[PDB]
RNA sequence: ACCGUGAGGGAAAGGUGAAAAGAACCCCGGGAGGGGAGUGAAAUAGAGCCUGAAACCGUGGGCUUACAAGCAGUCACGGCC
RNA sequence: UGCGAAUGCCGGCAUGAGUAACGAUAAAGAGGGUGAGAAUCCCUCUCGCCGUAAGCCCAAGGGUUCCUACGCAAUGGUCGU
RNA sequence: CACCUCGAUGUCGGCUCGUCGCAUCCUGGGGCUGAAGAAGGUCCCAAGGGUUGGGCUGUUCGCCCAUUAAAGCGGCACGCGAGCUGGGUUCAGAACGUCGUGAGACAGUUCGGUCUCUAUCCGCCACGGGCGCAGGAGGCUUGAGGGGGGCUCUUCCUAGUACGAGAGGACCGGAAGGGACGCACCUCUGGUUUCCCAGCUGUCCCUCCAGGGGCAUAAGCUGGGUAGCCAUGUGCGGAAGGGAUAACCGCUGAAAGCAUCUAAGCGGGAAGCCCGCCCCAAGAUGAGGCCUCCCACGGCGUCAAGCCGGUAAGGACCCGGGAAGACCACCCGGUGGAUGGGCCGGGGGUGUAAGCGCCGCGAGGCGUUGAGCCGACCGGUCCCAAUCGUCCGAGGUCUUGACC
């Protein structure tokens, strides 16, 4: 059953889940495109929305916030000075998932990108 | 014999006469009669009640106009009252008066393959001792070479929820016409913004 | 090698009606807007696909 | 249709307001209206309030207490009609949403746990000694 | 919810600390006992010289329940254990003097004298 | 060969054409393979090569079939090719 | 010297079936590169698992499996450059 | 008895799941009584439903404890091991008694002792695809025929009345509470809530501090915990009523003057039967109806029914999703748009973040602060994404009677 509910479990357990959440974030945040497969993708618009959000907040409360998720101490500084203030007056949204006609062979997975937005 | 249409809204609790009373809010919106059919050109009679209203135009040319009031015909018009002439024109949440016992036909929340067992409320196996892969299964389904088969109506695992689904003589605990908004006291069926049909009750008819 | 086995071979007749169902179906394809070729729709047609969104650009 | 919450939100006119601020750790006196044998009386209630079940309408709170050798619960809908009133009798520091831990403890032990939120307890005072001057003249 | 199996403290002076519940009189085929209904218990435990002796087939009347008891009036009331008053055939307790607080559901299903024997009633 | 520590056990597996004349070159292909060209009396003799049966798998065509039930045939009639 | 049966013998091809399964639940993700072709090869970064080991050194046994270039028909339980 | 089965038809008991019979255990209806009443006895009708929990033993059975309206008897390969169990029986070890010189043996006893992942057909539970229902579509429906359900107790009023010397104590009628069972449901009560919040240990790490991250499960441990899914929780059901009947009770009434409930007739009369309630249902090829839409093309078929295109009303494809769901199906959306994601507000959870300042030698404490963080719930908002499109789709056979 398990009506109502809300978030993919991607055939991994709770730290794997999560732990790979965070690693599509920190490459999607270091080359604002990414190519996965279409529902990993769904799935990490919110997770870096927010982390960005977060980053248009600014105050240091917040940095140590993203800190828990990207660990890494530049990275975030880009996102706080490049990538946050490209959205100041753009609010949600902050990324886009498009998907490709191309199916990953010998497996068939269909792939889709995912780019910061604007 | 008075029906009308309306959403599953929510559930709480009410307190009358120092008394706690559960009940669930249905919205049972103003219905207008698009169809009657009656023993002339139908052979019973009825009344087609369309529901919500919206639709910009989803409408397509099926659309009836016919019966005038069709204000822009509603989103689920399905389901006639059977044996109800109304006030003429627009059934509302009126026809009831607080103290008026209802039926409400709803549709049950889906479980989808639900295992005998919650289907059915069989016993399944021991969680030990013997034990064996057995846990939740039904046991035997027969006997021998004689009949030398299942039953016809065998009560097994399969789609169960999702369904028509009726609980009978409820209370109406009160009746908020300003907003069209109807006080059942308890169980009717399927999930909230549901659509349900309320209707006279049957213990009297 | 153990419990339930088929009692009889499955005719040839029985076999190919239940393969009746395995028939494919042709991916559904649109023209693309830009490039004169087919591409499956929603899809960012790779040719350079899109406008707004970048277009994975063949460019 | 979209009303959704706000209409069941609507239902709502048994809603209560008449009654005061209180947090899960400080003890209570509940009083609440009792039938007793056809008469009527309005018994009391006091004790440690152990939990609050927010839920808008019909959020509810637990009381505790040891009456006569004997610990007691009870448990009463926050906008209850048969509550006529109820008064704090003492402010305490809970730490931690539930309090069931209690339960198991129950002794002076209970005390140097749940210990008399003074800022709390320094409000409602001086907040009775403003709204009791600035009432009158 | 006491059931045959389970064990509960003697809020009375009849004599005896802790019985055991034996079977929920009510129809033929009931599945729990709470306040104000009637069971059958073996005296597990009790006082040298008390009218009750261990061993004893005994009625009694629950009094208080771990498990909550819900009221019409939306309230709840919950015991730290299940106690019971041995009583007669009759149903009249078989001592004198009840100790601690007894559910009021008592005096809703008929047992006046306990009620009234209680300390207090919750 | 393979199996068995060992004594020991112990198989499968023949055939283009008279002659390699065993298919230069070109086209598709990464190859494989195929398509033309060419050799030959013959190339469904092209080297997974004489003949090439049967089970078995396909493509095309004729008749036939979604209210009928059976050792599947048989005897009648009727249709359609 | 005539085969339809010997749970016959040898071989070929069927049915079950696109079904069970693909061999430890330590775990993956992205970018770049190579290439006819890349989830599977190379490199970078992130993540995870071993650590009286799942690291290292001997003895057996094995006998080219070693290093490198050029390769992917088969072997690799998928794919493979 | 030795008829199919020894190129195998697994054997007791339990569990699970039932289903049927009635020679009825209870409940309903009756006649007789050596039936005052109440309570029984005995026989008749009746199979709708119900038919408890424990101690002992492998047990079935039975004895016993506590109850009950009752604790019914049987069949179904002593129903059910490709459903489980494996205590008993019934291999190999071992021992006792007993028997035998012995090896060994015992419907005698004792302790131990491998229960085999894959369903082809039929059957059963579910869910689709196809074609059909002679014009093609979108809605709404009738119900032939099925299925579900069907139990019962206590107390009170009647009335301490009828009845009885008394003790006891009705009928009939009426009221309120239960037990078990069923369907639904989340407000409450109570669970879970795999990362929603906090606290804690060891270690490794980023950054030394502060603050944080991994691992300690497939949550490290712990305290809590929304939505959902749930019962311990909540609502509601068994009916009422109509009709026909069983045993039986009668009316009228001959044969047979009288008499007879019966032979012609009629009336009452069961928890049972048929309706009624609930659910399915037109493949009900007997394929029903009503409402509303598009229409009566182009070539061919020269005649019989047709063939190929575009098309119309519509419909799929594709895409965003869904208390719908294994896939499929179903439902809602698809820019003339609030469908999912994000953002915002509210609910809800956690329970006073970081940073800074003050107090303390310190662990820590206080304030800022109900702070901060915050899955699912109720909404709002076009910031992201449902872009653009593609294909499928009637023009209606014939006969007959009625109509302008
Ligand atoms: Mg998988
Ligand atoms: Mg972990
Ligand atoms: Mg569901
Ligand atoms: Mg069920
Ligand atoms: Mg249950
Ligand atoms: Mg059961
Ligand atoms: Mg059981
Ligand atoms: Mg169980
Ligand atoms: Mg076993
Ligand atoms: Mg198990
Ligand atoms: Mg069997
Ligand atoms: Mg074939
Ligand atoms: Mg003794
Ligand atoms: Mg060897
Ligand atoms: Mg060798
Ligand atoms: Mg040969
Ligand atoms: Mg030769
Ligand atoms: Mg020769
Ligand atoms: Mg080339
Ligand atoms: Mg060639
Ligand atoms: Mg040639
Ligand atoms: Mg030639
Ligand atoms: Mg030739
Ligand atoms: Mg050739
Ligand atoms: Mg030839
Ligand atoms: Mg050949
Ligand atoms: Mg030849
Ligand atoms: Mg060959
Ligand atoms: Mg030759
Ligand atoms: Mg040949
Ligand atoms: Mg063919
Ligand atoms: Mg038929
Ligand atoms: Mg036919
Ligand atoms: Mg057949
Ligand atoms: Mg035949
Ligand atoms: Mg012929
Ligand atoms: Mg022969
Ligand atoms: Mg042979
Ligand atoms: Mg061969
Ligand atoms: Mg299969
Ligand atoms: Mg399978
Ligand atoms: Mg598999
Ligand atoms: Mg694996
Ligand atoms: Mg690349
Ligand atoms: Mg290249
Ligand atoms: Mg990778
Ligand atoms: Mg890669
Ligand atoms: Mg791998
Ligand atoms: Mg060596
Ligand atoms: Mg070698
Ligand atoms: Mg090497
Ligand atoms: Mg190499
Ligand atoms: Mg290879
Ligand atoms: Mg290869
Ligand atoms: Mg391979
Ligand atoms: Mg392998
Ligand atoms: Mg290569
Ligand atoms: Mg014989
Ligand atoms: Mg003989
Ligand atoms: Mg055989
Ligand atoms: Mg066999
Ligand atoms: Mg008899
Ligand atoms: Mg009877
Ligand atoms: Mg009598
Ligand atoms: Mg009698
Ligand atoms: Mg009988
Ligand atoms: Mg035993
Ligand atoms: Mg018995
Ligand atoms: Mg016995
Ligand atoms: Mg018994
Ligand atoms: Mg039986
Ligand atoms: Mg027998
Ligand atoms: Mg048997
Ligand atoms: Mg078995
Ligand atoms: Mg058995
Ligand atoms: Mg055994
Ligand atoms: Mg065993
Ligand atoms: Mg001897
Ligand atoms: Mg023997
Ligand atoms: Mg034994
Ligand atoms: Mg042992
Ligand atoms: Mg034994
Ligand atoms: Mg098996
Ligand atoms: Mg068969
Ligand atoms: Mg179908
Ligand atoms: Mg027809
Ligand atoms: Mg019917
Ligand atoms: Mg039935
Ligand atoms: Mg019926
Ligand atoms: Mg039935
Ligand atoms: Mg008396
Ligand atoms: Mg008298
Ligand atoms: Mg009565
Ligand atoms: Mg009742
Ligand atoms: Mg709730
Ligand atoms: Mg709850
Ligand atoms: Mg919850
Ligand atoms: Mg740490
Ligand atoms: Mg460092
Ligand atoms: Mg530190
Ligand atoms: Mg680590
Ligand atoms: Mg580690
Ligand atoms: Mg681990
Ligand atoms: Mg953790
Ligand atoms: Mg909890
Ligand atoms: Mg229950
Ligand atoms: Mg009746
Ligand atoms: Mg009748
Ligand atoms: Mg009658
Ligand atoms: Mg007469
Ligand atoms: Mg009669
Ligand atoms: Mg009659
Ligand atoms: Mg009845
Ligand atoms: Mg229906
Ligand atoms: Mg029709
Ligand atoms: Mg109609
Ligand atoms: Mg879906
Ligand atoms: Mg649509
Ligand atoms: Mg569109
Ligand atoms: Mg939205
Ligand atoms: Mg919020
Ligand atoms: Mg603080
Ligand atoms: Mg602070
Ligand atoms: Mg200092």
Redesign the pocket.
Same mark, same amino acid.
């Given at each position: 059953?398990?009506?109502?509910?809300?978030?993919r479990?991607l055939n991994?357990?709770?730290?794997?889940?999560?732990?790979?959440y965070?690693?599509?974030a920190?490459?999607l945040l270091t080359?604002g495109?990414?190519?996965?497969?279409?529902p990993?993708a769904?799935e990490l618009?919110?997770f870096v929305?927010?982390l960005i959000?977060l980053a248009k907040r600014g105050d240091?409360?917040?940095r140590?916030?993203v800190?828990?998720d990207l660990?890494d101490?530049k990275l975030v500084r880009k996102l706080f000075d490049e990538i946050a203030p490209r959205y100041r007056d753009?609010?949600?949204?902050?990324?886009?998932?498009?998907?490709l006609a191309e199916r990953?062979?010998?497996?068939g997975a269909p792939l889709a990108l995912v780019e910061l937005?604007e | 014999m008075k029906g009308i249409l309306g959403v599953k809204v929510?559930?709480?609790?009410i307190f009358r006469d120092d008394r706690?009373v559960?009940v669930?809010v249905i919205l049972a919106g103003p219905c207008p009669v698009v169809?009657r059919?009656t023993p002339e050109?139908?052979?019973?009679t009825?009344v087609?009640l369309g529901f919500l209203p919206?639709?910009?135009?989803?409408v397509?040319?099926?659309?009836?106009g016919?019966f005038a009031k069709a204000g822009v015909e509603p989103?689920?018009?399905?389901? %006639?009252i059977?044996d109800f002439n109304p006030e003429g024109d627009t059934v509302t949440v009126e026809i009831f008066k607080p103290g008026e016992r209802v039926?409400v036909?709803?549709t049950?929340?889906?479980?989808?393959?639900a295992g005998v067992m919650?289907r059915?409320?069989?016993?399944?196996?021991?969680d030990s001792?013997?034990?064996?892969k057995?846990h939740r299964?039904?046991?035997?389904?027969?006997?021998?070479?004689?009949?030398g088969?299942?039953?016809?109506?065998?009560?097994?695992?399969?789609?169960y929820?999702?369904?028509?689904?009726?609980?009978?003589?409820? %209370?109406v605990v009160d009746v908020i016409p300003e907003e069209n908004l109807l006080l059942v006291?308890?169980?009717?069926?399927?999930?909230?913004?549901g659509l349900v049909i309320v209707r006279e009750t049957?213990?009297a008819? | 090698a153990?419990?339930?086995?088929?009692?009889?071979?499955?005719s040839?007749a029985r076999?190919?009606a239940?393969?009746s169902?395995?028939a494919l179906t042709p991916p559904?394809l649109?023209?693309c807007?830009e490039c004169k070729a087919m591409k499956?729709?929603?899809?960012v047609c790779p040719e350079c696909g899109y406008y707004?969104?970048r277009k994975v650009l063949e460019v | 249709?979209?009303?959704?919450?706000?209409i069941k939100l609507v239902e709502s006119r048994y809603v209560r307001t008449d009654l005061p601020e209180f947090?899960?750790g400080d003890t209570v006196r509940v009083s609440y209206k009792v039938k007793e044998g056809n008469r009527t009386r309005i018994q009391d209630f006091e004790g440690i309030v152990i939990?609050?079940?927010? +839920?808008?309408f +019909?959020?509810?709170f637990?009381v505790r207490k040891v009456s006569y050798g004997v610990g007691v619960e009870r448990?009463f809908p926050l906008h209850s009609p048969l509550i006529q009133k109820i008064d704090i009798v003492q402010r305490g520091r809970?730490?931690?949403?539930?309090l069931?831990?209690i339960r198991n403890l129950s002794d002076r032990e209970i005390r140097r746990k749940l210990r008399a939120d003074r800022?709390r307890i320094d409000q409602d005072r001086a907040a009775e000694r403003a709204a009791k001057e600035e009432a009158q003249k | 919810?006491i059931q045959?199996q389970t064990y509960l403290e003697v809020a009375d002076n009849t004599g005896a600390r802790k019985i055991m519940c034996?079977?929920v009189?009510?129809?033929?085929? *009931?599945?729990?006992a709470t306040v104000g209904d009637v069971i059958?218990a073996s005296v597990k435990e009790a006082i040298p010289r008390g009218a009750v002796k261990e061993g004893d087939?005994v009625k009694a009347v629950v009094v208080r329940t771990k498990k909550?008891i819900?009221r019409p009036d939306?309230s *709840?009331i919950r015991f730290d254990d299940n106690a019971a008053v041995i009583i007669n055939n009759q149903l009249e307790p078989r001592g004198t003097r009840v100790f601690g607080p007894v559910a009021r559901e008592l005096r809703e299903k008929g047992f006046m004298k306990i009620v009234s024997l209680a300390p207090e009633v919750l």
């Open positions: 059953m398990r009506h109502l509910k809300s978030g479990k991994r357990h709770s730290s794997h889940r999560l732990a790979l965070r690693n599509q920190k490459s080359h495109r990414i190519t996965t497969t279409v990993k769904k618009r919110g929305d927010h959000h240091l409360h917040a140590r916030l800190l828990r660990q101490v753009r609010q949600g949204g902050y990324t886009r998932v498009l998907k990953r062979r010998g497996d937005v | 929510g559930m709480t609790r706690a559960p669930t169809q059919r050109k139908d052979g019973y009825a087609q919206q639709n910009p135009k989803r397509n040319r099926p659309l009836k016919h989103v689920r018009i399905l389901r %006639e059977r039926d036909t709803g049950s929340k889906g479980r989808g393959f919650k059915w409320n069989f016993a399944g196996g021991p001792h013997g034990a064996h057995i299964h039904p046991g035997s389904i027969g006997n021998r070479k004689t009949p088969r299942v039953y016809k109506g065998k009560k097994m695992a399969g789609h929820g999702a369904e028509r689904v009726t609980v009978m003589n409820l %209370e006291k308890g169980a009717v069926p399927g999930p909230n913004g049957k213990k008819a | 153990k419990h339930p086995v088929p009692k009889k071979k499955t040839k076999r190919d239940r393969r169902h395995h559904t649109v023209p807007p499956p729709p929603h899809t707004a969104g | 249709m979209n009303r959704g919450a706000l947090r899960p939990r609050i079940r927010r +839920n808008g +019909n959020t509810t637990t448990i809970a730490r931690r949403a539930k069931y831990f800022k | 919810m045959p034996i079977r009189l009510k129809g033929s085929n *009931a599945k729990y059958v087939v909550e819900k939306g *709840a």
